[PDB]
Design a binder for this molecule. Structure first.
Ligand code: C2E
Ligand code: C2E
Ligand code: HEM
Ligand code: HEM
Ligand code: MG
Ligand code: MG
Ligand code: MG
Ligand code: MG
Lengths: 788, 788
């Protein structure tokens, strides 16, 4: 056989043993491997070749193999040890084989050195223990994006294992939530990115827990620039997303520049948001002495409380503030709390330094950013000037209410806009003599010089009605209210006035706000008296318990009744007799003047119908109307109704207007007068108007009568210069056919002294006091004519 | 023989070839490996076994081995590729030998399965990677303390490769500095410690500079509980401190609210400071397209450019920007680049969010959180509404300069206080119709409705005059200046108006500020001409070159001269004849009214003496005076000087006053009139008054004449109603001894129609034109009496 020397010189050392477990064949390669020679090996039991430990065990191993047979079993190639000539031990690769010839059974084992193979195995083990040491999960993927390798950190974080995850897609392996933010497409795009990339996803463990993980994919190529593998690393980011949220919230709040206390509160609550069940405190340095900035706690005692005290450093490096974090027993890692404190101190240094600079400047600042109004120091100086000038002012303290709603709904950048809108509305209505300033927060101070209750209440009502309509910001309505406190006293300092106004405003706010009040209950009760009087007047108007008293007018020469003027009168069961000089202006303030006008016109016309039933001529009847009455485009409707419902057509009715009405210039009012004048009813002007040119226009807008006021008539006795007034007034009387009326005559000498100027008619107490309608007919039939 | 069946039963495939390269031995193991049949194999050439692609190359190796002698070496045993009958490719293990038999050349080959070999090698390859990708330096130590495995992170961090660090001690590798001494003791105790341990050390690198290292050592035992290997991990301290400082600095930068490009720049320089010799670029995605955001100041390039790219996202999957960071290879470490890039992305996201929020807010803000004034949006809305209403407004653009000195001296807060003071000064003067707004910076816009040139000049002068008093801040003066551009055009839009106003303001500011001008050259020319005329008027008044003219006043009945009136006329060589209706209002605006008053009174008395030198009776003289003249407390001084210097005692002189003079109510003015009247000089009132009652009050301020306006006379015959005015006005004439003067008669019919009303005197063209003074004596002796 030509194969004898071939297997003799083959690379693998070949050892052949016969039935007797003795070596019969042996070759030079095995000589080199073991150390002994052919003459030293041939004819000896395999026991000498076996290492010493297995010496007894090897024979029964061979015997068991012989007994079993197993249809000529040859074993499997593996790795084993040798004992050399000097006793050294080496790793070798064995392949055994069983031979059966001539009924007997022989064996041969082929051996190669395995130093490289065992070095590889040691490298494998050391590399595995290097992988499974740090808790940063890494996995490897083939070109087809199938996971092929894992580690203990990954299997512990996600529950899976290499056996249940080998050779399958990573998206299919990792179950994602049901479209929370469309993260499925993001995960596929990160898997399919061809360059180094990273992303953040939301995943659930094998059990299922809401965990966010940051994944990073990197490609690794081969020598010839082909894709070889993709490695994906993961890291849990749950502890860092919350810190990102904290820094975002603090940054957003600080960009709006909130006040110091509320900024501290925001920081504290945001720290608590990331530290579950903790307590946080903030202190500032005031000349080295710590003071309390803000805090937030539930008050519950924290047993075994870990306490940390972080120090805030300014730009130069000096300490400025102290932040105390107290946490439960082992709630969170110390590095977490250290990081939170560091980021918080970095973000709070700016707040502390801006607060310090703000205090330093505001010690002496006499103005105010954010609505540009004056401030407390300016108000103090103004009030001190007023006090030393000895002029007692009226102080209104105004608190704007419901601003916290917009603060919590939109933010400080919009609360400021609401304040600006309110201040602009106030500026749109402030009078020249009023002083407006801002003291603190949502509080403002108005200084006025009106020492009169009727004007003070009007100013307060106007101020409260300023905010009647909602404020539209960012296309969102926001109804705000006002609480006003009013203080006015004589000889009082700034402190007394400010304290009283603050007390009034605080009482209104505590009771519910949306209103105004005085101090000084004695002055407060007058408002209740006025409201009850006005309610009684309105009730009387509605119930028609009002009256008309008629005073005649007489001629100078013939002593004949020129006409009468109807005057409104009122008597209440509770308030007695209310003079018309009192309750007519009261109706102007309320708004019942129109109701008065309709009643008087209807009653006066109806009374003329009653007098016409019997024999009474009554040439004319004068009825007073107010300026606010004539401002409406409804007068001819009711007046025409009066005439044609009782046959009192306008040649008998007469209407007199106030002097101030001609002072005003309204085209619509004048046209209504001209329409009314053309109907037949006359027009009369009291107080002789204002000027000849105006009365010349009153000649253009035709009238019939001119009335000389009582004050002018009374002064005619002494002031001899005003005689030409009546002479000129009467001159226009016959110049263009006007009837002049003398009012308030009281003595005979007055009647004779106005006779020479030729006053057309005379109306006064020298002839008759006003009389109730039930004896108007008696007066006509009794004294007519009179002494002339 | 007995070895051929043994060779057949060898479980490894065995083949043997000769010079002819035929296969003579193909055992069942080889059958199971390849798949070919024994008959198909025996006698064939190697070509039915050689791989197809290596077929062109194999005969070259055949020739090399068959010709070149390699000392009859067996060869090499290694892994190789086999293709199955179907075509699949597997890897097997080959051992080849060269045997010489019968003087010939024979080649022998043994082949295994090697499936597990493939698995082991591929897993080693897959596992060395993801050791090379762990972010921290981990090294595995054998029990006898020799480094066996070092990862890529450690390799690039310290600079000691695997070849240099294989089988040698960690202290000898990372030799620490001799100073201090305790380092060696500490590191030996750490290295030979058997428990998990951590510490800090001062290890040294191949190239130089010190690195402070946190070192951790952990053990790894075996099944039999003996130290099998140990693991050591390293971390750096300077790097983590730098990351913390970077995050803090960028957060502090954001909290101060800088602009977008400034924010990008500060981020860029922070990354530059934390990472040496790098270039950083930022792009922001607008409408899906990137735009440059910030870049390195060093615009050049550095060799060995390694680039890292990050995608800035914003709370969603939508990309928001791109970051590129480039650094030279070998300068720093991959983990440091990872960390800096990640933190930069997470901070730039906040920067982008803040920019977006600020832009959204500013798009809708309607007021100013500073000075409280309206802002550019409100101004735009106002101008748009006015243009839609089709009313052309006058736009003043005001720039306040000399404000940098306040910033340099005191600071930003005091600059804001000065700006507030200026705005308050504007508010204390703006009229109800005008509209004030702040656009930006030290610039404001005023909108007015009056389009008169004189009114605009008055408004501009008033605006410029308010800054004359220096701003008192902290008891320190601070002068400022105003540059005002006036734009006014018909039918133009707000863009054109604002552009023209800004052009004018910039022109003034560049030329030096402290002034105002129109945008229109024609308007500038008009202003220049008016100023030239005013200067000419002042020069003429100073150079006594004015002249007076006298218009006779005649008696209605006797045709005898009642008196004459002096009127001032001005003649200029350049401007010709300027009517008094043109240059008298100009004197009021300038301030020459007083000078005109003295000249007229002094000249009239001097002229009165000249007429009295010869025989002229001249019963009276009427001299016009202005209200502003009478408001000065000096009138009796010069007037009394006039009488006693020419013997012209007030029984002749007469002063006529404007109607508006009696409209005003000043006690000092009224007293001065009474003092003046008591001297003997008469008083005349033109255009009557607001009311005849005022004339009755004026009775206490004795008057002698009343003048009827020309407009009333010119409309007398057309409007028969105004006849009563003259009838009443004359009636007052004999009521209290007054003379009525009719001014402006032109025809005989007008004169006779005023005769029935018995007007006392007549002054008009029907009798005589205003006569120059040289022929007054001739007119007296030639025409009088006119005999009607
Ligand atoms: N000492 C004195 N007084 C005399 C003399 N002759 C008349 N009087 C008084 O002069 C007033 C005339 O009313 P008036 O001047 O229009 O001024 C009226 C008018 O302005 C207002 N008034 C009265 N009735 C009405 C009404 O129905 N409507 C309106 N709108 N105002 C009314 O009330 C004012 C006061 O009315 P009365 O209290 O009735 O006071 C009456 C009357 O009593 C006299 O010789 N001596
Ligand atoms: N067409 C016409 N005009 C007639 C007639 N009768 C008089 N006049 C004009 O009436 C004016 C009289 O001056 P005035 O009414 O006080 O109104 C004067 C006065 O307000 C002002 N003025 C003139 N001289 C002086 C002066 O020395 N001082 C002041 N302060 N104002 C003066 O100039 C105004 C008018 O300028 P004059 O040219 O003086 O206009 C003169 C005169 O020309 C007539 O029948 N027909
Ligand atoms: C340094 C030399 C040797 C070592 C270290 C060694 C070791 C071992 C050991 C530990 C076993 C136990 C079972 C196993 O591991 O599969 C075994 C099995 C066996 N050995 Fe050895 N052996 C050596 C030499 C030989 C030789 C030259 C033969 C020649 C026939 C032989 C015959 C056997 C047989 C027949 C089995 C039975 C395997 C079975 O039944 O599965 N041993 N060997
Ligand atoms: C799948 C089958 C085979 C493969 C992949 C293969 C591959 C190679 C390669 C790459 C070489 C270059 C030298 C080296 O790598 O050591 C080589 C050389 C050689 N091959 Fe093969 N061969 C194959 C089949 C065979 C067979 C069946 C024989 C039978 C004798 C053979 C005999 C030789 C010899 C003698 C050399 C010379 C080695 C030297 O001179 O370094 N080859 N073969
Ligand atoms: Mg009345
Ligand atoms: Mg009256
Ligand atoms: Mg005049
Ligand atoms: Mg005149």
């Amino acid at each position: 056989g030509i194969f004898f020397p071939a297997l003799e010189q083959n690379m693998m050392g070949a050892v052949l043993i016969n039935e007797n477990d003795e070596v019969m064949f042996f070759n030079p390669a095995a000589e080199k491997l073991w150390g002994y020679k052919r003459e030293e090996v041939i004819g000896n039991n395999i026991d000498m070749l076996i290492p010493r430990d297995l010496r007894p065990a090897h024979p029964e191993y061979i015997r068991h193999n012989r007994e079993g047979g197993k249809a000529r079993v040859e074993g499997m190639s593996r790795e084993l040890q040798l004992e050399k000539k000097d006793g050294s031990k080496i790793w070798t690769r064995f392949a055994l084989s069983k031979v059966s010839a001539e009924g007997k059974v022989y064996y041969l084992a082929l051996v190669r050195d395995a130093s490289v193979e065992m070095a590889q195995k040691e490298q494998t083990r050391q590399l595995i223990i290097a992988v499974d040491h740090l808790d940063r999960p890494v996995i490897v993927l083939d070109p087809e994006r199938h996971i092929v390798q894992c580690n203990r950190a990954f299997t512990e974080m996600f529950g899976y294992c290499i056996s249940e995850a080998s050779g399958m897609q990573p998206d299919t392996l990792l179950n994602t939530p049901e479209f929370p933010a469309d993260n499925r497409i993001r995960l596929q795009q990160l898997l399919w990115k061809t360059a180094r990339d990273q992303d953040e996803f939301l995943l659930l463990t094998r059990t299922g827990e809401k965990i966010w993980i940051k994944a990073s994919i990197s490609p690794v190529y081969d020598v010839l620039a082909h894709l070889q593998n993709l490695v994906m690393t993961f890291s849990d980011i749950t502890e860092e997303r919350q810190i990102r949220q904290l820094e975002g919230n603090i940054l957003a709040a600080m960009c709006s520049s909130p006040p110091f206390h509320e900024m501290g509160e925001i920081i504290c609550r945001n720290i608590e948001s990331v530290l579950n069940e903790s307590h946080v405190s903030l202190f500032a340095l005031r000349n080295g002495m710590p003071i309390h900035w803000a805090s937030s706690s539930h008050g519950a005692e924290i047993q075994n409380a870990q306490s940390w005290s972080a120090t805030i450093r300014q730009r130069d490096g000096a300490p400025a503030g102290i932040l105390q974090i107290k946490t439960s027993s082992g709630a969170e890692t110390s590095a977490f709390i250290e990081r939170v404190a560091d980021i918080s101190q970095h973000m709070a240094a700016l707040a502390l330094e801006q607060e310090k600079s703000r205090q330093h400047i505001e010690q002496l600042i006499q103005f105010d950013p954010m609505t540009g109004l004056p401030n407390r120091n300016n108000l103090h100086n103004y009030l001190d000037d007023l006090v030393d000038k000895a002029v007692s002012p009226v102080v209104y303290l105004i608190g704007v209410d419901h601003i916290q709603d917009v603060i919590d709904s939109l933010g400080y950048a919009w609360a400021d806009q609401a304040l600006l809108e309110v201040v602009n509305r106030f500026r749109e209505k402030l009078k020249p003599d009023q002083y407006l300033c801002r003291i603190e927060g949502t509080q403002f101070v108005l200084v006025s010089l009106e020492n009169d209750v009727s004007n003070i209440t009007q100013i307060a009502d106007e101020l409260r009605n300023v905010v009647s309509k909602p404020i539209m910001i960012d296309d969102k309505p926001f109804p705000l209210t006002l609480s006003i406190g009013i203080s006015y006293d004589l000889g009082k300092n700034r402190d007394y006035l400010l304290s009283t106004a603050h007390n009034a405003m605080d009482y209104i706010r505590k009771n519910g706000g949306n209103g105004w009040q005085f101090f000084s209950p004695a002055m407060n009760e007058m408002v209740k008296e006025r409201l009850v009087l006005g309610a009684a007047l309105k009730e009387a108007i509605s119930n028609n318990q009002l009256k008309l008293v008629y005073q005649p007018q007489i001629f100078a020469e013939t002593g004949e009744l020129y006409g009468i003027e109807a005057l409104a009168r009122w008597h209440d069961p509770l308030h007695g007799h209310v003079p018309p000089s009192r309750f007519i202006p009261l109706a102007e303030e309320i708004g019942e003047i129109e109701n008065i006008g309709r009643w008087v016109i209807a009653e006066a016309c109806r009374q003329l119908a009653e007098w016409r039933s019997q024999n009474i001529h009554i040439p004319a009847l004068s009825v007073n109307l107010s300026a606010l009455h004539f401002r409406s485009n409804q007068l001819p409707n009711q007046v025409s109704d009066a005439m044609h419902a009782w046959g009192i057509d306008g040649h008998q009715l007469t209407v007199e207007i106030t002097e101030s009405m001609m002072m005003e210039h309204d085209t619509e009012i004048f046209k209504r007068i001209q329409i009314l004048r053309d109907m037949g009813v006359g027009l009369s002007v009291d107080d002789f108007g204002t000027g000849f040119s105006g009365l010349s226009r009153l000649v253009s807008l035709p009238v019939t009568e001119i009335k000389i006021d009582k004050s002018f008539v009374d002064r005619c006795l002494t002031e001899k210069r005003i005689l030409a007034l009546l002479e000129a007034i009467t001159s226009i009387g016959q110049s263009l056919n006007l009837t002049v009326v003398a009012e308030g005559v009281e003595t005979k000498e007055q009647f004779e002294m106005l006779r020479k100027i030729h006053c057309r008619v005379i109306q006064g107490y020298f002839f008759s006091r006003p009389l109730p309608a039930e004896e108007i007919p008696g007066w006509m039939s009794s004294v007519l004519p009179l002494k002339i």
